[PDB]
Design a protein around this ligand. Structure first.
Ligand SMILES: CC(C)Cc1ccc([C@H](C)C(=O)O)cc1
Length: 533
C-alpha cells in the first residue's frame, strides 16, 4: 500500500496555483513556457496564459472530441508547444496520455494503438501518413486530432478547435493511484510493454523532488528530450512548473550541435538537462567562441556519464555535470544533487522517497563494495513515484520483484557514502544516446530483409558516441560475395525504413555462425562480453 492523499492532479494542485498567484497579484506574470524553432519564430506563455490555453485543450479533448475519463490518448508530436498543451489537457480531463516518438513508422503505430486500444491520437505532419496506413485496423480508435498549419481530410483540426474552445475547464477530481499515463517501454526480448503511471507517481513525485536539478522559481530550464521520453514529462514539464520556473523548448528539427551551442549562448538558460551524448557532441565544437556565463546547472541522465566527459566539460566551461539515474518504471531514482560532492564514475545517491540498495540473488541487501543488482524497496510501503505495473501483465510486473525490492535490471556497486556505481545492464536491453532499445525489435526488423537468414543484436562501445547498437548477421549464401560497406549501408536503411531510426544498427558484423544454447536460443551475453573487451 501507499501513504498518499486520496486525490491529486498536477494541473489543479500545482500549475493552477502559479496561475492563481498572477490573477491575485501576489506574483508578477512569470514565464512558464518559452518556445523557439531556430528560424526566427518564438512564442511564450506566462502561467496564467498556460492555464487558460491548457483548459481550452481539455475542452477540445473532452468537449469537441467527447473523450471520457479513463480513455487512452496516443500523443505523437515534435517539439512544439501543443504537446505540452495536450498533455496538460489530458491531465485536466482525466485522460490517459501515451507519448511516442515522431520517428515512429506505421507498424510501430499499429502495435501501440492495438495493444492499448487507444480511443484517440494527437499527431503532427511527420506521422499523418503512417497513422493513416494502419488506422482502419484499429477498431477502438475513434478520434484523430491533427496539429498542423494544413488541414486534412479525416483529421480534426486541433489548432482551429483550441481557439474556439472555452478558457474555463473544471479539472477532474482525479485519484492519486488513478492511471494518468502509459509509456511503452522495451524489454529484454519481445516487443514493448505498457508502463502505467498514476497522477501521484508522476505529479506528486515531481512536486516532492521539486528543485533537484538546482533550478529555482525565477530561472529558465532547457530539457533536451524526445517528446516520447518520460524525461520530457518529469524534467521538461513538471520540475520547472512545480517551482514556478520557466521551461525552454527548441524545435531542434535536426539535432545539430552547433544549433544547441548557439542557443545556450544566445538565450538566458540557467539549467540544462540532456543525455551524455549531447555534452560529448558539444565538446567537439568550439566552446570558446560561443560562451554562456548565465548557465549554472548542467544535469544528465539516460546513460553512464564517463569520467572523461565530466572532466573536459569542467575544463572547457568551468561547470560540473551532475549525473542522475532511473528508468521509465521508477522515474528519478538516484542523483548527485546540487550541494553534493561529485565522484567521477558514480551517479549519486538515492532520490528522496527511495530506499535504493544493491541486493543479492535471494533479495537481501548487500554491503558496500560488492557488485549486485540495483533495487528499490517497494514492500511493505511502495514509495511515491513507482509506477502501477505493466498493463494487462501482472506476471511481468511480478517477475521484476525480488523479495521486498523492485529490480531495475541494472548491476551496481555502492560506496561508503552510498554513491552508486553503474556496472552494466544485467539483461539484453541496449542503451544508445538516451533511447532504450529492445533487441527483438531490431532483430525482427533485420529478419524482414531476405539477405538475413539469422541475426542477434547487442550493445557495443563506440569511443565517440558511447553505447551503440551492433548487429551480428548471418548472410544467405547468395549474398556472401557482396561489397560489405554497401550491404551494410543497405541493411541500415532497411531498418531505418521499417521501424524508428534511433534503434538502427550503427555497427553490423557478418559471421557464418552465431553462438547458441544447446536448446537453440542465441547467446547474446557471450557476444556482449567479447564486444566489451
Ligand atoms: C529522471 C528520468 C529521466 C529517469 C529515466 C532515465 C532513463 C530512462 C530510459 C531512457 C528509458 O526510457 O527507460 C527513463 C527514465
Amino acid at each position: 500500500h501507499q501513504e498518499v492523499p486520496a486525490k491529486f492532479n498536477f494541473a489543479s494542485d500545482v500549475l493552477d496555483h502559479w496561475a492563481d498567484m498572477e490573477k491575485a497579484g501576489k506574483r508578477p506574470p512569470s514565464p512558464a513556457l518559452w518556445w523557439v524553432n531556430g528560424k526566427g519564430k518564438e512564442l511564450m506563455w506566462n502561467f496564467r496564459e498556460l492555464s487558460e490555453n491548457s483548459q481550452q485543450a481539455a475542452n477540445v479533448l473532452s468537449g469537441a472530441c467527447g473523450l471520457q475519463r479513463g480513455d487512452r490518448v496516443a500523443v505523437v508530436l515534435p517539439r512544439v508547444p501543443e504537446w505540452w498543451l495536450v498533455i496538460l489537457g489530458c491531465i485536466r480531463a482525466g485522460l490517459i496520455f501515451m507519448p511516442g516518438t515522431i520517428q515512429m513508422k506505421s507498424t510501430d503505430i499499429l502495435y501501440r494503438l492495438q495493444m492499448s486500444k487507444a480511443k484517440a491520437i494527437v499527431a503532427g505532419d511527420e506521422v499523418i501518413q503512417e497513422v493513416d496506413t494502419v488506422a482502419s485496423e484499429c477498431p477502438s480508435l475513434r478520434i484523430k486530432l491533427l496539429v498542423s498549419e494544413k488541414s486534412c481530410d479525416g483529421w480534426l483540426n486541433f489548432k482551429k478547435l483550441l481557439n474556439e474552445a472555452s478558457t474555463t475547464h473544471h479539472c477532474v477530481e482525479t485519484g492519486s493511484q488513478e492511471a494518468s499515463a502509459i509509456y511503452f517501454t522495451s524489454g529484454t526480448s519481445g516487443l514493448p510493454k505498457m508502463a502505467e503511471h498514476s497522477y501521484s507517481s508522476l505529479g506528486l513525485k515531481a512536486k516532492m523532488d521539486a528543485g533537484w536539478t538546482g533550478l529555482q522559481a525565477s530561472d529558465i530550464m532547457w530539457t533536451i528530450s524526445d517528446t516520447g521520453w518520460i524525461l520530457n514529462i518529469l524534467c521538461s514539464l513538471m520540475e520547472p512548473w512545480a517551482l514556478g520556473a520557466c521551461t525552454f523548448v527548441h524545435l531542434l528539427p535536426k539535432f545539430d550541435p552547433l544549433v544547441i551551442l548557439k542557443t545556450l549562448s544566445s538565450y538566458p538558460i540557467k539549467s540544462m538537462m540532456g543525455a551524455p551524448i549531447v555534452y560529448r557532441m558539444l565538446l567537439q565544437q568550439d566552446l570558446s567562441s560561443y560562451k554562456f556565463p548565465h548557465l549554472q546547472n548542467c544535469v544528465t541522465v539516460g546513460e553512464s556519464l564517463l569520467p572523461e566527459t565530466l572532466e573536459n566539460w569542467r575544463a572547457q566551461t568551468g561547470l560540473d555535470i551532475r549525473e542522475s539515474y532511473g528508468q521509465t518504471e521508477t522515474g528519478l531514482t538516484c542523483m548527485v544533487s546540487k550541494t553534493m560532492k561529485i565522484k567521477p564514475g558514480y551517479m549519486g545517491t538515492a532520490a528522496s522517497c527511495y530506499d535504493v540498495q544493491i541486493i543479492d540473488d535471494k533479495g537481501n541487501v548487500l554491503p558496500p563494495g560488492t557488485e549486485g543488482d540495483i533495487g528499490i524497496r517497494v514492500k511493505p510501503i511502495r514509495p511515491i513515484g513507482i509506477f502501477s505495473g505493466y498493463v494487462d501483465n501482472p506476471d511481468k510486473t511480478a517477475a521484476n520483484i525480488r523479495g521486498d525490492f523492485w529490480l531495475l535490471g541494472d548491476r551496481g556497486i555502492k560506496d561508503e557514502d552510498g554513491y552508486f556505481q553503474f556496472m552494466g545492464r544485467a539483461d539484453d536491453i541496449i542503451n544508445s544516446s538516451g533511447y532504450r532499445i529492445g533487441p527483438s525489435e531490431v532483430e525482427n526488423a533485420l529478419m524482414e530483409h531476405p539477405a538475413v537468414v539469422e541475426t542477434a543484436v547487442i550493445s557495443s562501445p563506440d569511443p565517440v558516441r558511447g553505447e551503440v547498437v551492433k548487429a551480428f548477421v548471418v548472410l544467405a549464401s547468395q549474398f556472401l560475395s557482396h561489397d560489405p560497406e554497401q550491404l551494410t549501408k543497405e541493411l541500415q536503411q532497411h531498418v531505418k525504413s521499417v521501424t524508428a531510426p534511433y534503434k538502427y544498427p550503427r555497427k553490423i558484423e557478418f559471421v557464418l555462425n552465431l553462438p547458441k544454447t544447446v536448446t537453440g536460443k542465441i547467446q547474446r551475453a557471450k557476444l556482449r562480453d567479447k564486444e566489451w573487451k
